[PDB]
């Protein structure tokens, strides 16, 4: 279900309406999913870069690369969080 377009619930009638427990749970899952997807995408991009620069071509190369792999990513999309997460491919 990482194909699924992420959207917060449309059930609350207005911006200040208290969420039902169902809606709160639903929105929590959507929030966390979006953050996770963006983090995965940026980390994979970093990994591709690191791999391409290293160009491992033996198991020994790969053992070495694993030892130095330290990938740092930040998710910071503000109000565009879901839009950005939905735009992702693969």
């Amino acid at each position: 279900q990482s194909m699924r377009k992420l959207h917060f619930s449309t059930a609350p009638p207005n911006p200040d309406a208290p969420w039902t427990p169902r809606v709160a749970g639903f929105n929590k899952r959507v929030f966390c999913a979006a953050v996770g997807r963006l983090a995965a995408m940026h980390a994979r991009m970093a990994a591709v870069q690191l791999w391409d620069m290293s160009r491992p071509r033996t198991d020994e190369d790969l053992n070495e690369l694993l030892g130095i792999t330290t990938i740092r990513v930040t998710v910071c999309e503000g109000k565009n969080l879901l839009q950005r997460a939905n735009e992702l491919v693969n």
């Binding site: 980390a43 990938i71 740092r72 990513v73 950005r84």
Partner: peptide, 6 residues
Amino acid sequence: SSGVDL
């Protein structure tokens, strides 16, 4: 958002 290797 961003991602980089050390």
